[PDB]
Design a protein around this ligand. Structure first.
Ligand code: BCL
Ligand code: BCL
Ligand code: BCL
Ligand code: BCL
Ligand SMILES: CC[C@H]1c2cc3[nH]c4c(c3C)C(=O)[C@H](C(=O)OC)c4c3nc(cc4[nH]c(cc(n2)[C@@H]1C)c(C(C)=O)c4C)[C@@H](C)[C@@H]3CCC(=O)OC/C=C(/C)CCC[C@@H](C)CCC[C@@H](C)CCCC(C)C
Ligand SMILES: CC[C@H]1c2cc3[nH]c4c(c3C)C(=O)[C@H](C(=O)OC)c4c3nc(cc4[nH]c(cc(n2)[C@@H]1C)c(C(C)=O)c4C)[C@@H](C)[C@@H]3CCC(=O)OC/C=C(\C)CCC[C@@H](C)CCC[C@@H](C)CCCC(C)C
Ligand SMILES: COC1=C(OC)C(=O)C(C/C=C(\C)CC/C=C(\C)CC/C=C(\C)CC/C=C(\C)CC/C=C(\C)CC/C=C(\C)CC/C=C(\C)CC/C=C(\C)CC/C=C(\C)CCC=C(C)C)=C(C)C1=O
Ligand SMILES: COC1=C(OC)C(=O)C(C/C=C(\C)CC/C=C(\C)CC/C=C(\C)CC/C=C(\C)CC/C=C(\C)CC/C=C(\C)CC/C=C(\C)CC/C=C(\C)CC/C=C(\C)CCC=C(C)C)=C(C)C1=O
Ligand SMILES: COC(C)(C)C(=O)C/C=C(\C)CC/C=C(\C)CC/C=C(\C)CCCC/C(C)=C/CC[C@H](C)CC/C=C(\C)CCC=C(C)C
Ligand SMILES: CCCCCCCCCCCC[N+](C)(C)[O-]
Ligand SMILES: CCCCCCCCCCCC[N+](C)(C)[O-]
Ligand SMILES: CCCCCCCCCCCC[N+](C)(C)[O-]
Ligand SMILES: CCCCCCCCCCCC[N+](C)(C)[O-]
Ligand SMILES: [Cl-]
Ligand SMILES: [Fe+3]
Ligand SMILES: [K+]
Lengths: 281, 302, 241
C-alpha cells in the first residue's frame, strides 16, 4: 500500500517523543508514539464503553449510554456503574484526542508542512472539553455534562437548552450560529467555483483563477481570492466553534436565568424606556 | 514567530483588473470600485467591477422593494417614532394571513396582505438572482455548479415560504419577517411537531452542517499548511500536480487512512454543504404534510 | 410504508452511491497503489479506478487525462532501512540536494504558469507594469537572515502574481552577486530585516536557481519551495531558538 508518489516522502525524522522507536507505518497509517498513545486511550475507552453496556444490560448502539455521576457526587469520583465509568472514559477520550492532535503535529513535521490542521483540531477538542470539563468544574458537578449515547445526548441538549427558555436568545449562540451558516455558504460557493472552473462547458478549455475572480466580481461586485477563501473557511469554522464554547461557558455560570430576558438591557435604556407606543409599552 | 499566512505581510497593487471577457457584454460591467487596504490583509483589495444587466437590475430592485415593505410596517408598528423604532427593532414583525384566509390573496393589508406583497417581491428577487448566477457562468464558459448549488439553498426557502404553505392549505404556516419573531416561529415549529430532534432529516441536516464546518476547517487549514508550495493555486495543481498537492494528500492518508485529490476535495466540499439544505428541506416539507409528530413517527417506523 | 419511511431509505441508498462516486472521483491521482519497490501492490482496496476524463488545458498546452500511467519521472535517492513493508527509507545522499523527504519536489512542467491572457503569472515587480508595494513594510533592500542568525543576503525585488495581485517571492542576492527566490510564506518581514527560519545562512547558495532571470517555471517553483521547506528538518543542526 503506497500512493505512486509516496515513497520519496517516507523518510525518517519528525517525531516529538521516542526518537525513532515508533517511527514507522502500518498500511496507510503513520504510527508515532502518539499513534500508540492514541490506540491505547482509544481501545481502553471502547472497552469500558462495551462493559458499561453490560452493567447497563444492553447490546444496541441506539440504547447504550454512559451517564455522568449525578449532581450529588459533586466534583468527586463515583462507583463505576453509576458514574465512574463516564469519568474514566472521559479521561480516555481526552487522551485519545490530544494524542491524535500531537500525532498530526508529527506527520506535519515529517512532511515539511505547517501546523494549521492540528491547530484547527485543537478548537474542536476545546469545544468538547468546555462541555465535559470546563463547564461542569465551574458549575460544581460532572452531572451537568452530556452523557455518551446517540439519542440520549440529544436529550441533554434539549433539556439544557430549555432550562434557559428558547436558547436562540443566547447572544453568543446567536453569533456562533451565524458563523455555522456562513461557513456552509462559503463551502458551497468555494467548491462550486473551483469545479465550475476545472469542468467548463463541453469542449471548452479549463478556466483560470482570473475567470474565478471575474465570475464573482460580476456576480456580487467582489472577489476574495484563492488565498482569501482558504483563510476564510478556516476563520468561519474556527469562529463558529469558538463562539459555541463561549455561548455555553457563560450559561449556568454568569447567566442562569431565561435568555430572552437578557435583551431587556437594551429596551430599558434611559432615553427610550418610557416612551409610549411600539411593542414595549 | 514563524509566519503562518493568516494575514498578509506586504500588500502589492497594480493596475485595476477589469477581468476576463469571453462572451460577457462589457457594456453592462461597471467601473472599478475603490481599493480596501483593510480587506487587503485577508484577501483581495479590489472592490468591483460588477455586472448589472436587466435581470440583475430587476433583482436588485425587487429585493429592496421586499426590504422596504418590511421596514415601513416596522415604522408603522413603532408609531413613526425614531426612538421606539430603534428600541424595539428586533421585536417588530410582519406576520402572514391568519389561518382563515386560506391560500387566498383576499386578506386585508394590515393583516398579512402586506406580508404577501413583500413575499412576492422576495420570490422575484431570489429567482431572478438565481438565473443571474447561471448566466454569469454561461458568459464565461464555466460549469453550472454555482447555480446548481444555489438551487439547493433555494429548495429550503421555497419549502418554508411557498411549497409547505401551499400543501398545508394556508399562508399562516410561513415564516414571518422579523428578527426575534422568526426565531420564535422556529421554536414553535419544533413543539407543534413532536420535536424535530426526531426528524431523521433534521439529524442529517445537522450532520452535514457540522460536517461543513469540519471539512472547510480541515481543507482551509490543509491549503494554508501547503501554501509554502503554492497550494492555493488549486486549478494548476489539478492540471499538473505539485509537491503541494502531494504532501496534502499524504498528511491525510497518513493520519486517517485515505485521502483526496486537489480536484476531488472540492466535490467533497460542494456535496457536504449542499446536503445541509437538501435533507433540511425534505425534513421540513414532510413535517405537517405527512408526519404530525416526529416522536410518534419515531416509535412506529423506526 | 408511509412517505417519510420511503424518503429516508431512499436517501441512505443515494448517500452510499454518492460516497462511492466521491471516493472513485478522488482516485484519479496516485493510483493504482504500489509496493515500496514500484510494482503494482497486490491489494488496491474496495474501490475501482474511474473512467478516464480529459482536461483541455488552455493556451494550447495540451491535455491531461486521469487516471493515467504514472511515474515519478525522476531518480529517488533513498534506500530501505528494514527487511519488510512499512519502515522509513534512508537518504542515500544529501536529502536537500537530492530533493527527498521534506525537501521533495515534483517533476512538474518546465514552463511558467500563465494568466488568463497567456502572459506569465509571476513576474519580478520591476518588470510588472504599474505594480508597487501598497501596505505594510516594503521588504526590498532589507538584509536577509538565516536561522543560524547570520546574514545570508539582501532583498532586491518582490516577485508578484499579476492576476491575483499578491507577493509570491522575495528575490534575494547572495554574497557572490547571484540571486535566489524565497517563498513569501516562509519569510518573516521585520522592521529592520527579513528573517528566514527554515534555512541557515550557509544553505542559501544550495537553493535551486532559475534559468531565465525574469520568469519562473512550475518545475522551478517546486524545486525552490521544496528545498526551503526541507530546511526545517535538515537545517536543525544550525537553528538556535
Ligand atoms: C434555520 C431555521 C430558521 C433560522 C434560524 C436562525 C437562527 C437560529 C439564527 C438566525 C439568525 C439570522 N437569520 Mg434566520 N433562520 C432562517 C432563515 C432565515 C432567512 C431566510 C431567507 O430564510 C433569513 C433572511 C434569515 C435571517 C437571519 C438573520 C437575522 C440572522 C443572520 C443570517 C445568517 O447567519 O446567515 C448567513 C448570511 C450572510 C452571511 C449574509 C448576510 C445576511 C444579512 C444579515 C442580511 C439579512 C437581512 C437582515 C434580516 C437585516 C437586519 C436588520 C437590520 C438591523 C436593519 N434567517 C430559518 C427559517 N436564523 C441569527 C441571529 O442572530 O438572529 C437574530 C441566529 O441566531
Ligand atoms: C433545544 C436545543 C436548543 C439549543 C441549545 C444548545 C445547546 C444546549 C448547545 C447548543 C450548541 C450549539 N447550537 Mg444550539 N440549540 C438550539 C438551536 C440551534 C440552532 C437552530 C437553527 O435552531 C442551531 C443552528 C444551533 C447551533 C448550535 C451551535 C452554536 C452549537 C453546536 C455546534 C458545536 O458547538 O460544536 C462543537 C463541536 C464539538 C463539541 C465536537 C467535538 C469533536 C471532538 C473534539 C472529537 C470527536 C471525536 C469522536 C470520538 C469521533 C469518533 C471518530 C470515528 C470513530 C471515526 N442551535 C435549540 C434552541 N445549542 C452547543 C454548543 O454551543 O457547544 C459548545 C451546546 O452545548
Ligand atoms: C455539538 C453540540 C452537541 C451535539 C449535538 C448534536 C445534534 C443536535 C445532533 C448531533 C448528531 C450527531 N452527533 Mg452530537 N453533539 C455533541 C457532541 C458530539 C460528539 C462529541 C464527542 O463531542 C460526538 C462524537 C457526536 C456525534 C454525533 C453523531 C452521532 C451525529 C452526527 C454528527 C456529525 O455528523 O458531525 C460532523 C462529523 C462528521 C461528519 C464526522 C463523522 C463523525 C461520526 C459520524 C460520529 C461518530 C460517533 C459514533 C457513532 C459513536 C462514537 C463512539 C465510538 C464507539 C468510538 N456529537 C454535543 C453535545 N449532535 C445528530 C444526530 O443525528 O444524532 C442522533 C444531531 O441531530
Ligand atoms: C428549538 C428549535 C428546534 C429547531 C428547529 C428548526 C427548524 C424549524 C428548522 C431547523 C432547521 C435546521 N436546524 Mg434545527 N432546531 C433545533 C435545534 C438545532 C440544533 C441544535 C444544536 O440542537 C442545530 C445544530 C440545528 C440546526 C439546524 C440546521 C441544520 C437546519 C437549518 C438548515 C440551514 O442551513 O438553513 C439555512 C438556509 C436557508 C434558510 C436557505 C435560504 C436561502 C435563501 C434563498 C436566501 C435568501 C436571501 C435573502 C434575500 C437575504 C439577502 C441579504 C443579502 C445580504 C443581500 N437545529 C430545535 C430542535 N431547525 C431547518 C431545517 O431544514 O430543518 C430540518 C428548519 O426549517
Ligand atoms: C445550502 C448552503 C448555504 C447557501 C448556499 C448558497 N447561497 C447563495 C448561493 C449559494 C450556493 C449563491 O450562489 C447566492 C449568491 O449570490 O452567493 C453569494 C446565495 C445567496 N444566499 C444569500 C443569503 C443567505 N444564504 C443562507 C444560507 C445558505 N445558502 C446555506 C447555508 C442564508 C441563511 C442562513 O439564512 C442567507 C441569508 C445571499 C447572499 C444570496 C442570495 C441573494 C438573493 O436572492 O438576492 C436578493 C437581492 C437583493 C437585492 C436584496 C437586498 C436587500 C437588503 C438586505 C439590502 C440592505 C441595504 C440597505 C441598508 C441600504 C438602503 C439604501 C437605499 C437608500 C438605496
Ligand atoms: C474546529 C472546527 C470543526 C472540527 C475540526 C476538526 N476535526 C477534526 C480535525 C479538525 C481540524 C482533524 O484533524 C481530525 C481528523 O482526523 O479529521 C478527519 C478531526 C476529527 N473530528 C472528528 C469528529 C467530529 N468533529 C466535529 C466538529 C468539528 N471538528 C468542528 C465543527 C464533530 C461534531 C460537530 O460533533 C465530530 C463528531 C473526527 C472525525 C476526527 C477526530 C478523530 C480522533 O480524534 O480520533 C481519535 C479517537 C478515536 C478513534 C476514538 C475515541 C473513542 C473513545 C475515547 C470513546 C468515545 C468518546 C465519547 C466522547 C463518545 C461520544 C458519544 C456520542 C454519541 C455523543
Ligand atoms: C475567490 O472567490 C471567492 C470565494 O471563493 C470561492 C468566496 O466564496 C467568497 C464568498 C464570501 C462570502 C459570501 C462570505 C461573506 C462573509 C464575511 C465577509 C464575514 C464577515 C463576518 C460576519 C459573519 C458578519 C456579517 C453578518 C452581519 C452583519 C449580521 C449580524 C449578525 C451577527 C450576530 C454577526 C456577529 C458578528 C461578530 C463577528 C461579532 C463580533 C464580536 C464583538 C462584539 C467584538 C468570495 C467573496 C470570493 O469571491
Ligand atoms: C487538498 O487537500 C486535501 C486532501 O488532500 C489532497 C485531503 O485528502 C483532505 C482530506 C479530506 C477528505 C478525504 C474528504 C472526506 C473527509 C470527511 C467527510 C471528514 C470525516 C472523515 C471520517 C468520517 C473518517 C475518519 C476516520 C479516522 C479519524 C481514522 C479511522 C479509524 C480507524 C478504523 C483506524 C485508526 C487507527 C488508529 C487508532 C491510529 C493509530 C495507528 C495504529 C494502527 C497503531 C483534505 C481536507 C484536503 O484539503
Ligand atoms: C431605516 O428604515 C428603512 C425604512 C430605511 C428600512 O428599510 C429598514 C428596514 C428594516 C429594518 C427591515 C429589516 C428586515 C428584516 C428584519 C427581515 C427579516 C426576515 C427574515 C428573518 C427572513 C426569514 C425567512 C423568510 C422566508 C422563509 C421566506 C419565504 C419566502 C417565500 C419562498 C416566498 C413566498 C411567495 C409568496 C407568499 C407570494 C406568492 C404569490 C405569487 C403570485 C408567486
Ligand atoms: C433540487 C436540488 C438539486 C441539487 C443537485 C445537486 C447539484 C450539485 C452539483 C453536482 C455537479 C454535477 N453537475 C450536474 C453540475 O454536473
Ligand atoms: C458526505 C459525507 C458524509 C458524512 C455523513 C455522516 C452520517 C451521519 C449519520 C448521523 C445519523 C442521522 N440520523 C438521525 C438519521 O440517524
Ligand atoms: C446505487 C445507486 C444509487 C444512485 C446514487 C448515485 C449518486 C449520484 C452522484 C452524482 C453524479 C454526478 N455526475 C456524474 C453527474 O457528475
Ligand atoms: C464520511 C467519511 C466516509 C469514509 C469512508 C471512506 C472509505 C475509505 C476507502 C478508501 C480506500 C483506502 N485505501 C487505503 C484502501 O486506498
Ligand atoms: Cl500570520
Ligand atoms: Fe480549495
Ligand atoms: K512596477
Amino acid at each position: 500500500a503506497l500512493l505512486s508518489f509516496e515513497r520519496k516522502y517516507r523518510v525518517p525524522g519528525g517525531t516529538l517523543v521516542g526518537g525513532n522507536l515508533f517511527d514507522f507505518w502500518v498500511g496507510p497509517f503513520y504510527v508515532g508514539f502518539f499513534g500508540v498513545a492514541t490506540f491505547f486511550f482509544a481501545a481502553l475507552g471502547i472497552i469500558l464503553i462495551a462493559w458499561s453496556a453490560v452493567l447497563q444490560g444492553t447490546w444496541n448502539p441506539q440504547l447504550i449510554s454512559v451517564y455522568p455521576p449525578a449532581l450529588e457526587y459533586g466534583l468527586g469520583g463515583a462507583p463505576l456503574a453509576k458514574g465512574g465509568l463516564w469519568q474514566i472514559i472521559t479521561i480516555c477520550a481526552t487522551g485519545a484526542f490530544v494524542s491524535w492532535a500531537l500525532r498530526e503535529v508529527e506527520i506535519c513535521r515529517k512532511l515539511g508542512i505547517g501546523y494549521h490542521i492540528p491547530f484547527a483540531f485543537a478548537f474542536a477538542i476545546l469545544a468538547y472539553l468546555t462541555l465535559v470539563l470546563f463547564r461542569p468544574v465551574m458549575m460544581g458537578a460532572w452531572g451537568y455534562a452530556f452523557p455518551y449515547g446517540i439519542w440520549t445526548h440529544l436529550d441533554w441538549v434539549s433539556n439544557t437548552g430549555y432550562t434557559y427558555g428558547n436558547f436562540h436568545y443566547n447572544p453568543a449562540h446567536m453569533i456562533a450560529h451565524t458563523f455555522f451558516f456562513t461557513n456552509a455558504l462559503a463551502l458551497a460557493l468555494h467548491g462550486a467555483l473551483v469545479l465550475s472552473a476545472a469542468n467548463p462547458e463541453k469542449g471548452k478549455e479549463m478556466r483560470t483563477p482570473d475567470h474565478e475572480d471575474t465570475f464573482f466580481r460580476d456576480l456580487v461586485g467582489y472577489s476574495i481570492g484563492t488565498l482569501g477563501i482558504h483563510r476564510l473557511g478556516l476563520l468561519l469554522s474556527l469562529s463558529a466553534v469558538f463562539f459555541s464554547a463561549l455561548c455555553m461557558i457563560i450559561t449556568g455560570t454568569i447567566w442562569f436565568d431565561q435568555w430572552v430576558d437578557w435583551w431587556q438591557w437594551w429596551v430599558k435604556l434611559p432615553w427610550w424606556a418610557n416612551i409610549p407606543g411600539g411593542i414595549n409599552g | 514567530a514563524e509566519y503562518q499566512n493568516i494575514f498578509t505581510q506586504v500588500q502589492v497593487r497594480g493596475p485595476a483588473d477589469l477581468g476576463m471577457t469571453e462572451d460577457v457584454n462589457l457594456a453592462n460591467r461597471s467601473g472599478v470600485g475603490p481599493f480596501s487596504t483593510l480587506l487587503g490583509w485577508f484577501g483581495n483589495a479590489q472592490l468591483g467591477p460588477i455586472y448589472l444587466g436587466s435581470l440583475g437590475v430587476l433583482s436588485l430592485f425587487s429585493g429592496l422593494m421586499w426590504f422596504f415593505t418590511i421596514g415601513i410596517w416596522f415604522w408603522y408598528q413603532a408609531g413613526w417614532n425614531p426612538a421606539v423604532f430603534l428600541r424595539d427593532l428586533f421585536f417588530f414583525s410582519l406576520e402572514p394571513p391568519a389561518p382563515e384566509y386560506g391560500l387566498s390573496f383576499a386578506a386585508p393589508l394590515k393583516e398579512g396582505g402586506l406580508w404577501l406583497i413583500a413575499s412576492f417581491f422576495m420570490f422575484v428577487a431570489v429567482w431572478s438572482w438565481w438565473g443571474r448566477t447561471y448566466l454569469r457562468a454561461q458568459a464565461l464558459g464555466m460549469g453550472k455548479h454555482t447555480a446548481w448549488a444555489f438551487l439547493s439553498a433555494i429548495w429550503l426557502w421555497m419549502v418554508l415560504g411557498f411549497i409547505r404553505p401551499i400543501l398545508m392549505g394556508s399562508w399562516s404556516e410561513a415564516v414571518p419577517y422579523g428578527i426575534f419573531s422568526h426565531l420564535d416561529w422556529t421554536n414553535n415549529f419544533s413543539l407543534v411537531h413532536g420535536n424535530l430532534f426526531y426528524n431523521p432529516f433534521h439529524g442529517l441536516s445537522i450532520a452535514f452542517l457540522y460536517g461543513s464546518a469540519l471539512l472547510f476547517a480541515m481543507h482551509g487549514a490543509t491549503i494554508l499548511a501547503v501554501s509554502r508550495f503554492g497550494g492555493e493555486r488549486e486549478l494548476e495543481q489539478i492540471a499538473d500536480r505539485g509537491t503541494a498537492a502531494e504532501r496534502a494528500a499524504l498528511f491525510w492518508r497518513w493520519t486517517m487512512g485515505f485521502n483526496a485529490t486537489m480536484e476531488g476535495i472540492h466535490r467533497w466540499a460542494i456535496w457536504m454543504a449542499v446536503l445541509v439544505t437538501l435533507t433540511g428541506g425534505i425534513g421540513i416539507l414532510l413535517s405537517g404534510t405527512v408526519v404530525d409528530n416526529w416522536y410518534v413517527w419515531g416509535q412506529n417506523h423506526g | 410504508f408511509d412517505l417519510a419511511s420511503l424518503a429516508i431509505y431512499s436517501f441512505w441508498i443515494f448517500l452510499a452511491g454518492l460516497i462511492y462516486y466521491l471516493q472513485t472521483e478522488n482516485m484519479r491521482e496516485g493510483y493504482p497503489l504500489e509496493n515500496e519497490d514500484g510494482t503494482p501492490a497486490a491489494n488496491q482496496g474496495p474501490f475501482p479506478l474511474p473512467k478516464p476524463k480529459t482536461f483541455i488545458l488552455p493556451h494550447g498546452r495540451g491535455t491531461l487525462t486521469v487516471p493515467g500511467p504514472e511515474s515519478e519521472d525522476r531518480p529517488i535517492a533513498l534506500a530501505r532501512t528494514a527487511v519488510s513493508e512499512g519502515f522509513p527509507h534512508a537518504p542515500t545522499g544529501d536529502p536537500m540536494k537530492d530533493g527527498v523527504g521534506p525537501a521533495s519536489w515534483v517533476a512538474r512542467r518546465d514552463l511558467p504558469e500563465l494568466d488568463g491572457h497567456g502572459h506569465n503569472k509571476i513576474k519580478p515587480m520591476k518588470a510588472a507594469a504599474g505594480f508597487h508595494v501598497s501596505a505594510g513594510k516594503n521588504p526590498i533592500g532589507l538584509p536577509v537572515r538565516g536561522c543560524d542568525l547570520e546574514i545570508a543576503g539582501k532583498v532586491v525585488d518582490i516577485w508578484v502574481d499579476i492576476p491575483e495581485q499578491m507577493a509570491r517571492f522575495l528575490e534575494v542576492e547572495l554574497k557572490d552577486g547571484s540571486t535566489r527566490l524565497l517563498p513569501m510564506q516562509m519569510v518573516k518581514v521585520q522592521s529592520n530585516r527579513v528573517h528566514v527560519n527554515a534555512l541557515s545562512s550557509d544553505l542559501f547558495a544550495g537553493i535551486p536557481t532559475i534559468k531565465s532571470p525574469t520568469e519562473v517555471t512550475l518545475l522551478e517553483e517546486d524545486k525552490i519551495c521544496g528545498y526551503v521547506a526541507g530546511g526545517l528538518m535538515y537545517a536543525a543542526p544550525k537553528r538556535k531558538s
